[PDB]
Structure 1
Amino acid sequence: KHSTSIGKIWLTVLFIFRIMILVVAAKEVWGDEQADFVCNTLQPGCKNVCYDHYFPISHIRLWALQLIFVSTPALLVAMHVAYRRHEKKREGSLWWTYTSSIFFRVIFEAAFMYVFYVMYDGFSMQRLVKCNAWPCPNTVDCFVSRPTEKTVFTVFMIAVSGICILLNVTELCYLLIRYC
């Protein structure tokens, strides 16, 4: 509604960039994450628990959840605006919705980025994971599928999300120096 140049151009383009990466290239990279997960063992069920332990949620599913979460505040505004428009036919209020929506986008973007770091150590996928969860005997060596390609796409998504955080913080800074 009252977006700046970066609000409606550099934020909408980067959002489409993230979706395009997810659906065109990234999704099929993760297609055989479990199928080509190879563990050096003869113990039945060891592969299931080790993959589940080291990948509690896939990266692409986490990114899909993140994109769904950061697009919801914009969607809520587009229905509140279309509702107040018809209600009158039957600033101030609009300002508080647009400032909170930016605030919620920053929180959602930072929360998922924090989840990525805590759950997956850093941002580089390792070739070998060592697993001692039951029923694997002692420690079992398992090997990840396409660790390098997944690292490349992880860096792309994290870097763009970090840029989107900065582009949202500046808009909050601009809106919080005039009003207050």
Structure 2
Amino acid sequence: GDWSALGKLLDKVQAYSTAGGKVWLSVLFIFRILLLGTAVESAWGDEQSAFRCNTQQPGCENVCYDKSFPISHVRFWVLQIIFVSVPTLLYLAHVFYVMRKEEKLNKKRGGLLRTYIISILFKSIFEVAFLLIQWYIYGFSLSAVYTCKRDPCPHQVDCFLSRPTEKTIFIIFMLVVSLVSLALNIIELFYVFFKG
């Protein structure tokens, strides 16, 4: 019978947001987490043990793999999804302490407002900033044959990837769900801008 303490808190945090934004944001988060957590991380299991190159020089594989993948995609998306959800839990833990400060007082405009919109700006700024770095570094497709020109390897070598087609589909999926989570925060911003 002690679960009525949460119905205050979840209603107080969403006090300025529309009804069509609360459910759509919540479902895409669980969707993102499950798709990241059961399907795609097994695809990136043998990312180094299956990477083979066409040479005899010892150590050529270690450097020609490292030039191709300065970071993996599954560790990139975790770094993305943590930075995206930091400001929401910040706002959540802040509102709890503010409610605790006023709860102590009554028995024994613009205060929380600006903090909300600033967090909604920062969530979208981080999202578009992570999209730009992925556009700059990797691209949005993966070829099957890579050409490597590092040391200690000789002149030019060919290396063959591991599942170049299965990774492309999840690349496009994580592009699309990130674009939708950006586009919906834009609408949530314009809904609270146009009230007054």
8 Å Cα contact 2:51/2:65 also seen in 1: yes
* Alignment map for 1:73-88 (pairs within 5 Å): 73-88=87-102
Match of 1:94 in 2: 112
Q: Is the 8 A contact 1:99 1:172 kept in 2?
A: yes
Unaligned runs of 5+ in 2: 1-13
8 A Cα contact 1:39 1:47, kept in partner: yes
Give the greater-gyration-radius structure (CA): 2
In percent, how many aligned pairs have the same letter? 52
Q: Runs of at least 4 residues of structure 1 off by over 4 A? A: none
1:115 aligns to 2:133 (yes or no):
yes
* 1:5 Cα deviation after fit: 2.6
2:142 corresponds to which of 114, 117, 125: 125
RMSD: 1.1
Contact 2:146/2:159 (8 A) holds in 1: yes
Amino acid aligned to 2:177: V
Q: Note if contact 1:6-1:167 (Cα within 8 Å) is conserved in structure 2.
A: no
| Alignment partner, residue 175 of structure 1 | 192
TM-score (norm 1): 0.95
**Unaligned stretches of 5+ residues in structure 1:** none
CA distance in 1, matches of 2:19, 2:128: 23
- In the alignment, which residue of structure 2 is the partner of 1:105? 123
Aligned length: 178
Could you say which residue in structure 2 is the equivalent of 1:164? 181
Q: TM-score, normalised by structure 2?
A: 0.87
Paired residues of 2:117 and 2:189 also in contact (CA < 8 A): yes
Aligned equivalent of 1:72: 86
Output one character per residue of 1:28-80: Cα deviation in whole Å (capped at 9) or x when no partner.
10111111111101111111111111111100101111111111111001100
The more displaced of 158-167 and 43-52 is: 43-52
